[PDB]
Amino acid sequence: CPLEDIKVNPWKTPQSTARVITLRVEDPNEINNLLSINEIDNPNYILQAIMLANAFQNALVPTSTDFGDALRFSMPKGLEIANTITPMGAVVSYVDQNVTQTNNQVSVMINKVLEVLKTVLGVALSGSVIDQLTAAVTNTFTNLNTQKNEAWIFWGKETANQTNYTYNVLFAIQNAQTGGVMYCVPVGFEIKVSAVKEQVLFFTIQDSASYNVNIQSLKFAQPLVSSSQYPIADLTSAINGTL
């Protein structure tokens, strides 16, 4: 079928070669209420990632009674916990900002939230994790039906005109843009949306809604520690939180 010459299109995004593995660990020894999303080019840093999530579990706090009976990541408490973490590390940035909108599509809200998180991460880091970051924020406001009973989402007060819920997600990043450190970015969402739960469960990005959202997050940089030498038992203990 005669070999044609190369028509090199320089804007054609190539298919990813990244391997994605999702772990659902039933009945963990200790409960973890953070959705853990880990970016890693060297799997020897996975344990470190899981241990950072174990640490920031202690930074979750109850919401006010008016909101409901829910847990959310606290930036203030996050700072406290950061100091106690070993090996020692630094809080590069932190945010506690409200985001609102009126009668806009859910896609707009996802963007507004993305803007805040992209500010936290920075251009370089943002770009290296844009796919999972976009997906993670998307899954905060949509695809909630399948998530409704998960350990990282908490349903608060539910009126006829409003639904309150929290959503806890953590990003661990180790790649070319990080170098000799692994970044950790826990995010605690406190969301008020102008719809009944039943509608919220099946909200899409096309749907329109008014939002009042509080975003609490920080970026924690911890020097890399390989775990190749250690047995898998330690990783198992890390996942269970018994390490």
Considering only 100, 102, 199, 204, the residue that binds its own copies (CB under 8 A) is 204
The answer to whether 126 contacts its own copies (rule: CB under 8 A) is: no
Q: Does 198 bind its own copies (CB under 8 A)?
A: no
Does residue 86 bind its own copies (CB under 8 A)? no
Find the shortest distance in angstroms from Cβ 96 to its own copies: 26
By CB under 8 A, residue 9 contacts its own copies: no
Q: How far, in Å, are 2, 8, 11, 186 from residue 5 at the CA level?
A: 10, 9, 18, 49
* Nearer residue to its own copies within complex by CB, 100 or 242: 242
Interacting residue with its own copies among 3, 23, 161, 180 (CB under 8 A): 23
Beta bridge partners of 218: 94
- Radius of gyration of the chain from Cα atoms? 19
4-42 burial code (b ≥16 CB/10 A, e <16): eeeeeeeeeeeeeeeeeeeeeeeeeeeebbbbbbbbbee
Closest to 77 measured CA to CA, from 97, 98, 53, 60: 60
Considering CB distances under 5 to 8 angstroms, the limit depending on partner class, which of Ca ion, its own copies, none binds residue 73?
none
Residues within window 210-229 making contact with its own copies, judged by CB under 8 A: 227-229
Of the candidate spans 30-38, 59-67, 128-136, 153-161, the one that interacts with Ca ion by CB under 5 A turns out to be 128-136
14 makes contact, choosing from its own copies, Ca ion, none, with CB < 5 to 8 Å by partner type, with: its own copies
Applying the rule CB under 8 A, the residues between 133 and 172 that interact with its own copies are: 134-135, 138, 143, 146-147, 149-152, 154
Burial of 118-139, coded b for 16+ CB within 10 Å and e otherwise, reads: bebbeeebbebbeebbeebbbb
- Beta strand 208-223 with 71-73 is unpaired
Stretch that binds its own copies, among 37-45, 85-93, 116-124, 217-225 (CB under 8 A): 37-45
Yes or no: say if 190 and 56 are a contact pair by the CB < 8 Å rule: no
Residue 87's SS3 state is coil
Q: Considering the complex, what minimum distance in angstroms separates the CB of residue 45 from its own copies?
A: 10
Strands 163-174 and 35-40, sheet pairing: parallel
Interface residues with its own copies (CB under 8 A) are 13-28, 31-32, 35-44, 46-47, 50, 53, 131-132, 134-135, 138, 143, 146-147, 149-152, 154, 175, 202, 204-206, 227-236, 239-240
